[PDB]
Amino acid sequence: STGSATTTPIDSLDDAYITPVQIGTPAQTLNLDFDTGSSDLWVFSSETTASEVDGQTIYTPSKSTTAKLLSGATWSISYGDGSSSSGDVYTDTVSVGGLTVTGQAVESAKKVSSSFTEDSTIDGLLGLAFSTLNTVSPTQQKTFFDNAKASLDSPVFTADLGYHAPGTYNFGFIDTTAYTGSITYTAVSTKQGFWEWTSTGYAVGSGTFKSTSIDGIADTGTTLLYLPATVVSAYWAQVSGAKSSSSVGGYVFPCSATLPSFTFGVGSARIVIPGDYIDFGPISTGSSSCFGGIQSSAGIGINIFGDVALKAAFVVFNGATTPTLGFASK
Template sequence: MSNSNTTTKTKLTVGFLVLAALAGVAVAAPADDFAAGRQLKRDLNLDKIPVINNPNHVPNFRAAVRQVELKYNVTVGSPAPRVPGESPANGGYLPLDPDSTWDIAYLAQVEIGTPPQTLTLNLDTGSSDLWVFSSDLSAADQANHDVFDYHKSTTWKPISGATFSVGYGDGSAASGGVGRDVVKLGGLTIPNQAVEIAQTQYKFAKGNNDGLVGLGYYTGRHGNKVSTGPEKTPVDNLIAQGTLPPGSQLFTSAFYSTRNPEKSFYTFGYIDEDLVAQSGQSLKWAPIDGSQGYWQFPSTTARVGGKAVTGIPSNQVAIADTGTSLALVHPAVAKALYAQIPDVVTDRDGFYHFPNSSISKLPKFEVAVGPNLWTIQPEDLAYLWDDADQLWVGGVQALNDGLSIFGDSFLKSVYAVWDRGNNRLGLVSKIQKTQNFDRNDQ
């Protein structure tokens, strides 16, 4: 979420040759992927962190697109060429609408300080900062938010000279000081965690979250935006401090649509064995290259209706990102998918739409995470019903920058194990039995 992303596209391909070699090799795994976490769960009485479906989140396709473009410095869609002097088809991008709640659909409660103060935060694998609304903000900025009052925490320790600044390219930003304090996440206690306290903000206040917990990678070079140097993420600290022993150095995510009754959740330190068992599958793993701070892996194949897609570069990489709503894929993949959906409409910006009559004819669509293919459930191929055009906006769109980004439109179809200790991502399929296409219940 930083402006310092102008070289992201180039950097993300660094190290791909190593990843490509790993992709065809089975990742070494413990004899029992669950044993260490099972023991830790018993010893520390760990439980799931319920994920709160943001009550005021209204899907906003243009905001979702613009958010990911600013976050990764990429271009979504395939805009048609324009006559010189002609305005863009969409009238030009405006700054993100604050009332879109920053495209944040999933939130979780985190405790900070002593005694603990509870904030509702966005857990984001696509970033590495832990920043929160603080009591130093103006009364207007604090309205409708829980804020962290570090003055009331007996364990708060400021980091001398440290500041932070995060923001989007449209000018929305938060900045302030940095200190260390106790953070509690899913029953795990993290002492001396770097916490960035927003003392000024611009255009974040109308969102529904009180800040963000970055679950990306800390590499020493890449990580958060603390001025005195990158600080460890909560997960990296849990590992460094010995709280998560080998075999349990992971977290997991299970996302469900707001249209369905199941409850979304995270776990830290252990895998939900019941959900894996319900899938009828064993976990399949992909090697992760975290050298640029992201959960990055090769994604060189895809299938539509059982047929392999051609035209995907041999060096195609993807990022799994809980902080992105859409699934963004190589243009050849998007083209192949929508070629199999009847009556598709492509707008001037290269975005795909289809009528309600096409719902019953959506093909099976699979994308690669490392060496394995995973199905995106039909419900998530339809992101949003557009009343004005009487069309569904596709939950999968084209991305033109040598990169794919698998956000919630992908993650809702899987149970994901983010294994930081072994630098791998484990998945099992989680396709919901009932697919909901109620246009009035998004």
Template sequence: MASTVATNLNTLGRTTFIKNPSFKATPLNAYAKVLSKFCIIPSIEGPLKVVQQIEQQGAQTVLETVGLKKKGYAVKSHTLVKHNLATGQTGQVTAQDVSDAEYLAPVTIGSPGQTMNLQFDSGSSDLWVFSSEMPADQQQGVQSAGNSIFDPSKSSTFQRTHGTWSITYGDGSGASGNCGTDNINIGGITIKNQIIELADTASSQFLSGSESGLCGLAFPPLNTVKPTRAQTPMVNMISQSDIPKDSELFTCYFSGQSGNSYFTTGYIDHDACGGATPAYSPVDSSQGFWEVKSETACINGKAVSRSGNTAIVDTGTSLCLLEDSLLAALYGALPGAKIDHSVQGWVYPTDTPITSIPKLEIAVGSNYFTIEPEYFGFADLGNGYTYGSCQSRGSNFPFDILGDRFLCNIYAIFDQGKCQFGAVQRTSSGATTSGRPVDSGTESSTAQLVH
């Protein structure tokens, strides 16, 4: 099912992503961020661990919002802490231990407009911003980091509502506050009466970051507003007919280091497709995520069966998180690769020839998409090894997470109207394809992973 490629883009939205100049590809920080976001329990010993396994009470986590219990996973009130491998002592995960957002996008709120640089996150569903309702010392911290604060008293279109919101992450960090409605503008499209979640308090992990808040692009079940969940900007764009009926979608083009990254609403960029037809996969949105089937992978031409496996597509995560058995097969195909407990993940020799990097194809629905060699490594550790972009999804998390290092290899189409995810493969040579059909055959027999 293909969505229309728009020919008249005058009334449709395009936003250029800002490559965060403060972002550093620091392995443990990137891993800490995703462990914290999804309350993941690490399966590899290292400087991060989880303590306090008791039933969740109080503020909601992202996953508790939908009562996630898939494959035996139940949300607990556990806390991610730093763990000294030598002494066994633990300590708090601080702002310096968690990565900033890698990509930011300007969103204008209110009348007259106040511009906020937000992280566009397809792994959550809250639109929250730093606000003038925060304590003075927290506002000072936000401004010291170079970020903006939304002041609802300066907007003639802001209306107070009775809603409240609260998000708590796995490291104990969080933000909360009250709600109101206002007009917002994303890429030239104005959305009226959007619920804005105003932070009246936020933990230090947020205050020193490079973003002024977050724009959630997942489905409404993940939203934390009470007593009634807020609709996301995409849902409101659709209900207000801000985008064409046959293109109720947004797309993302992450370009790695080149800086030409962008986000569109209401149309598919024909140039990004390069003549290739997007391959679509049904999305299971019941738990709020962009969740697709991913029941096989292919390593150097050898298919690996992963019956029943699914993945979520998350623009708010830098790494790709996969189950441990698949990682063992992947890095087992790379000479010199090993688990380095000091960075709690897989590393491989930095001087590995590009021709020796395993070809990893990940199934999204019925098509494979390849992680190109230039995105196989996440960061040079400076000790002769490179930290891989694919790392462990832990012992309790039921999905793979396809983050930015996967998305840099495709043009991604999040079709909310048809509840499907589309992709076009982008290759190192600049060519584009529809991906490789899973049933197109492999170079050797299919293997079954041992769990």
């Protein structure tokens, strides 16, 4: 089998991407944030504290003939940005882009933190990291991908995120029309439960490439590109007036700037992030200070190849017995 679904930016900045997902019988369609940095499929629901729901579409398990309470199971998750959610668990039929999994763990939120409430466009998350990070207790549950894997034509999914435009998540096949040149594959460590890999270096604008190993994760659920302070300083030093602002919470730059591109290495290959992808706009409405899309990972404890980087590439998440990551230009 295969599946193919369109993923759409939630706003004009590409702060995140939503993908329609069918849950239950008859189908209830929720727009979920596909997150290769976590491993829980959780949804706003009829059980979510009413004051914490503001415009989201909810899953109502009592209206699904295929929903079953997973008795005794609870979940609770905290993300890197400090947001969180928790609740209980149902199993139900879940379909993405025509690909169906029966008996999928659907984690029903009883509580969500303010950032989730305030984002009316995101009805939940669909985790695509390794199932060892799943938070369901006392019986850990599998991700949608893990459950689908054995039925897929090939044990892969791909992320093709757009810049200010829709893109595609495919399951079970590589669309050879969706990228240019060849795909370069690189080793993955699953030790921390992430799609963790090592970039071979970087360049700033038309500058020379610096060969250096940068360990990090491919994370569709993180907006920006978080890299070591040395790398980030070298980037922003090429933008007149750019500075790190403790009050704002990272690098900012004059909105009048033209940003240089940023290149990252994948083996001997190179992915170029255009300068425009690095512009996240005014820090506050009407400001002439703009927020940068490349930020320091210092104090995160991990480098994160988030949407800023991934949307510059066609990305293969290869879930074969020895997982790997592939990157192509597009």
